Write a protein that holds these residues in place. Structure first.
Motif, PDB file in Angstrom:
ATOM      1  N   UNK A 276      17.101 -22.325 -12.686  1.00  0.00           N
ATOM      2  CA  UNK A 276      15.661 -22.591 -12.672  1.00  0.00           C
ATOM      3  C   UNK A 276      14.917 -21.533 -11.861  1.00  0.00           C
ATOM      4  N   UNK A 277      13.622 -21.405 -12.164  1.00  0.00           N
ATOM      5  CA  UNK A 277      12.679 -20.593 -11.395  1.00  0.00           C
ATOM      6  C   UNK A 277      12.223 -21.302 -10.122  1.00  0.00           C
ATOM      7  N   UNK A 278      12.389 -20.644  -8.971  1.00  0.00           N
ATOM      8  CA  UNK A 278      12.198 -21.283  -7.675  1.00  0.00           C
ATOM      9  C   UNK A 278      11.363 -20.417  -6.732  1.00  0.00           C
ATOM     10  N   UNK A 279      10.417 -21.077  -6.059  1.00  0.00           N
ATOM     11  CA  UNK A 279       9.435 -20.427  -5.195  1.00  0.00           C
ATOM     12  C   UNK A 279      10.118 -19.953  -3.903  1.00  0.00           C
ATOM     13  N   UNK A 280       9.738 -18.777  -3.400  1.00  0.00           N
ATOM     14  CA  UNK A 280      10.338 -18.200  -2.196  1.00  0.00           C
ATOM     15  C   UNK A 280       9.531 -18.603  -0.950  1.00  0.00           C
ATOM     16  N   UNK A 281      10.227 -19.220   0.011  1.00  0.00           N
ATOM     17  CA  UNK A 281       9.683 -19.575   1.319  1.00  0.00           C
ATOM     18  C   UNK A 281      10.812 -19.597   2.342  1.00  0.00           C
ATOM     19  N   UNK A 282      10.427 -19.707   3.616  1.00  0.00           N
ATOM     20  CA  UNK A 282      11.368 -19.621   4.722  1.00  0.00           C
ATOM     21  C   UNK A 282      12.243 -20.840   4.945  1.00  0.00           C
ATOM     22  N   UNK A 283      11.935 -21.979   4.328  1.00  0.00           N
ATOM     23  CA  UNK A 283      12.756 -23.155   4.542  1.00  0.00           C
ATOM     24  C   UNK A 283      13.822 -23.384   3.489  1.00  0.00           C
ATOM     25  N   UNK A 284      14.140 -22.347   2.710  1.00  0.00           N
ATOM     26  CA  UNK A 284      15.110 -22.468   1.627  1.00  0.00           C
ATOM     27  C   UNK A 284      16.537 -22.546   2.159  1.00  0.00           C
TER      28      UNK A 284
END
Ligand code: APR
Ligand code: APR
Ligand code: MG
Ligand code: MG
Ligand code: MG
Lengths: 305, 431, 21, 48
Positions: A276-284
């Motif tokens: 899947x397409x997944x948003x990039x952020x620091x809590x991954x």
């Protein structure tokens, strides 16, 4: 209000750290990695536990007694596995095994040192509390290639999503078969092949499930025609041991227009369950050092992180 | 005056076969202790009589390893016995979850959510699945369906309560005895020693899921989600979860719902956990200007102030679960009660239904129930532009049939204008 | 919508070729 | 209503409703009564 906000961030653009006044100490942590106690897929075999302040090789640590363990799959000797006796093999240069080229060079500045007693290599990035090869088939550096296919996260109106004054990226992520945690597609370099083919082949095999569309594939080739190697780093992979460790080369494929990315029919194959397409952020929470890799791609593209 | 044989529906879905009650019910297990895995036979099923309620409510205590389809057949067998073979099939499963104790809200906001839920339930004949306990939003939903039950002539829509066994004060009472219990007195005010949570008297059914523990909650969440998915596949009806206030288990319930494909509707401004979920969804998907300042740090602060995880690993898991819920933008629909209009909650429920996985004709039938002509017109135009002519022609006849039955003339004009031959309409049953 | 698109392309701006795969 | 502070609104809604009754403002009584003001908890200004 959107245009006013966009122009406002378009006009806004002796280093001192005063955080010691608030807490009352320094940071005092380089973020040293210690792998978990139970080795994955080994049937409950546990390493010899060591604290994070004892890992570096500059530090003495006289009580270091690692356990030597090799997995039965690796010990059955397949085609992609190096021999159990590591003598006569030359490290830090490209070595030919059965007429096929293998990289064998580490990105560490000191290099790989050879143990005199057994001939096995010693990991320069610190201790992991476990000798032997474990689940890894090759002695020393296992070169891995990761494929980060990115596109700008866009709304239905066509506007790019913006968070913290920076444009938001979006990457293809696969769910691993062994531990069911999401990760970047990629894999170990096969014999006689380079990082470009390996990266691309793993992306078609894992994210797309190709093999095990003509002109659209050509479109994918157009997608694959503009890639930048953003980093070549050492992985904080839980399967790493003292005689076999994973080092990754990251290849970023960015779709500026978004045309090539929109033609992908995502369907999990090979060693991946779902993609899947997944948003990039620091809590991954991703497998190994893929957060560092995502940090490098957003750093290179001046994206949100 | 007790049933000895029951009509259990076949796996083919074409007819019901008559079989003995002990034969069908043998497949349900109970745990004598936590250590036990294989288990022992349950034998705790029957009906409970509550004060000031005319009808009696069936109860079944079942295990976590039991098949949810089997429980679905069990529910079908009661309804088929009581109301005949041609009982009203559900076209909507409405799951109401949230705060058991921490649900504190102003009366006007409560009245608005209650009013919207009551209208939706009365127009669609929905099966509402809430918790089995006598507290908070479940009790409030029970009061809504209590008022709903004194209407609609014969048929009353079931209010299924699925609760974890081990917290119920009458648990000893349903254990003691022989397997059939038709009239049994339930005493909510009796002072029972190792348990303090009573059952809601307005719920029409009860499933007490047991795994072997005392005073532990949240063991029934996965089975509840699986049961909703099984019911949704069997009756071809969309399942919509609604999140009002809620604690940590409501977050886990939403996580199960989004993993099993069930869409959720989060009512923003109605509570803490709802604010956390709405904040996460608005940060990840909403293109409006006021959500551009949203950060992972403020979200983490919200999770820490709301759930109180105590440790960093717990906070990381809760934050990860909250971010995992709103990964797919289609499966979460956020209704802003304190910002938007009073009458747009059914539009949000309908948006969740249309964004879910289901056939286009059933969704148009569902749109016809909520009396939203514009949504159906836009859906028909979008469907018309995107080809797919075989499926529209295959479902237009039954949609037209449903429009004739439910008295929607604007909808008959709509369906007839989109190449629906008048002479190809077909009856539901076989003559 | 035209101005939003124009500003979006006004803000967006080890070579490897992996087409062999 | 959006910013919480429910105790102070409930504490002052009764006298505000009382003032609305004295000064002949029916639109204001509908407003104050809609925001969770119990009709039977209104209190006189002086002591009997
Ligand atoms: N040198 C090797 N070591 C271990 N397994 C190997 C090797 N070479 C081939 N394999 C085989 O490849 C199979 C898995 O396919 P890959 O895609 O190569 O494995 P994967 O774990 O997805 O790739 C390694 C991943 O770990 C990260 O450190 C790195 O970033 C990469 O994404 C394994 O089951 C194994 O049989
Ligand atoms: N289903 C329940 N019924 C009654 N009490 C409960 C329940 N679940 C938990 N409790 C206890 O009551 C307290 C109030 O619960 P909340 O924190 O308000 O909500 P949460 O703990 O998430 O419970 C949500 C539960 O309710 C159902 O809608 C849903 O099935 C979910 O399991 C909690 O501390 C908990 O110990
Ligand atoms: Mg892989
Ligand atoms: Mg592979
Ligand atoms: Mg692979």
């Amino acid at each position: 209000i959107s245009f006013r906000f966009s122009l406002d961030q378009q006009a806004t653009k002796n280093r001192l750290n005063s955080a010691v006044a608030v807490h009352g100490h320094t940071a005092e942590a380089a973020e040293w990695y210690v792998p978990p106690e139970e080795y994955p897929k080994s049937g409950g075999v546990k390493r010899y536990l060591i604290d994070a302040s004892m890992v570096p090789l500059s530090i003495m640590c006289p009580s270091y007694d690692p356990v030597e363990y090799t997995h039965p799959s690796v010990a059955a000797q397949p085609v992609w596995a190096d021999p159990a006796d590591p003598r006569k093999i030359k490290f830090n240069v490209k070595d030919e095994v059965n007429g096929k080229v293998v990289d064998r060079t580490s990105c560490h500045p000191s290099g790989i040192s050879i143990d005199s007693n057994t001939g096995r290599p010693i990991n320069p990035w610190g201790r992991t509390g476990m000798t032997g090869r474990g689940l890894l088939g090759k002695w020393g550096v296992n070169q891995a290639a990761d494929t980060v296919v990115t596109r700008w996260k866009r709304s239905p109106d066509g506007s790019i999503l913006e968070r913290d004054g920076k444009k938001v990226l979006e990457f293809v992520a696969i769910q691993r078969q062994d531990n069911k945690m999401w990760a970047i597609p990629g894999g170990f370099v096969d014999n006689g092949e380079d990082v470009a083919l390996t990266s691309g082949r793993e992306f078609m095999e894992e994210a797309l499930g190709m093999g095990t569309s003509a002109e659209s594939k050509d479109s994918l080739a157009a997608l694959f025609s503009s890639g930048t190697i953003v980093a070549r780093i050492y992985c904080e992979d839980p399967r790493n041991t003292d005689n076999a460790w994973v080092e990754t080369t990251c290849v970023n494929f960015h779709d500026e227009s978004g045309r090539h990315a929109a033609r992908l029919k995502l369907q999990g194959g090979d060693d991946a369950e779902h993609a899947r397409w997944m948003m990039v952020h620091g809590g991954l929470n991703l497998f190994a050092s893929h957060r560092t890799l995502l940090q490098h791609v957003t750093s290179a593209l001046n994206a949100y992180f | 005056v007790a049933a000895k044989t029951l009509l259990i529906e076949n796996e083919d879905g074409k007819g019901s076969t008559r079989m003995e009650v002990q034969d069908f019910m043998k497949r349900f297990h109970m745990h004598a202790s936590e250590d036990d895995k294989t288990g022992s036979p349950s034998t705790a099923w029957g009906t409970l009589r509550f004060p000031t309620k005319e009808a009696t409510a069936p109860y079944l205590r079942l295990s976590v390893n039991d098949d949810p389809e089997d429980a679905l057949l069990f529910v079908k067998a009661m309804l088929a016995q009581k109301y005949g073979e041609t009982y009203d099939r559900p076209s909507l499963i409405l799951s109401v979850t949230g705060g058991a104790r921490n649900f504190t809200l102003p009366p006007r906001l409560e009245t608005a959510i209650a009013k919207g839920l009551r209208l939706a339930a009365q127009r669609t004949n929905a099966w509402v699945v809430t918790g089995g306990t006598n507290t908070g939003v479940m009790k409030l939903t029970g009061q809504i369906m209590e008022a709903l039950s004194k209407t609609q002539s014969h048929f009353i829509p079931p209010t299924i309560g699925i609760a974890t066994y081990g917290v119920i004060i009458g648990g000893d009472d349903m254990t003691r005895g022989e397997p059939p219990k038709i009239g049994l007195e339930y005493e909510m005010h009796k002072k029972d020693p190792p348990k303090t949570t009573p059952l809601d008297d307005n719920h029409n059914l009860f499933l007490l899921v047991d795994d072997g523990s005392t005073n532990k909650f949240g063991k029934e969440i996965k089975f509840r989600a699986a049961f909703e998915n099984a019911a949704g596949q069997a009756f071809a009806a969309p399942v919509v979860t609604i999140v009002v206030q809620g604690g940590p288990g409501t977050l886990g319930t939403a996580l199960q719902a989004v993993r099993q494909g069930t869409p959720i509707v989060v009512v923003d401004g109605s509570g803490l956990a709802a604010d956390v979920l709405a904040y996460a969804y608005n940060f990840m998907h909403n293109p409006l200007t006021r959500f551009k300042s949203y950060t992972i740090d403020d979200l983490r602060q919200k999770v820490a102030q709301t759930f109180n995880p105590k440790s960093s690993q717990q906070l990381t898991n809760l934050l990860d679960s909250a971010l995992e819920c709103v990964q797919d933008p289609n499966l979460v629909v956020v209704y802003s009660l304190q910002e938007s209009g009073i009458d747009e909650f059914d539009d949000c429920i309908l948006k969740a239904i249309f964004s879910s996985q289901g056939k286009l004709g059933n969704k148009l039938k569902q749109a016809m129930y909520f009396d939203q002509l514009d949504v159906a017109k836009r859906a028909l135009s979008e469907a018309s532009k995107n080809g797919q002519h075989n499926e529209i022609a295959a479902c237009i006849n039954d949609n037209l049939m449903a429009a004739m039955m439910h008295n929607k003339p604007h909808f008959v004009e709509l369906y007839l204008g989109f190449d629906a031959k008048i002479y190809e309409l077909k009856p539901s049953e076989e003559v």
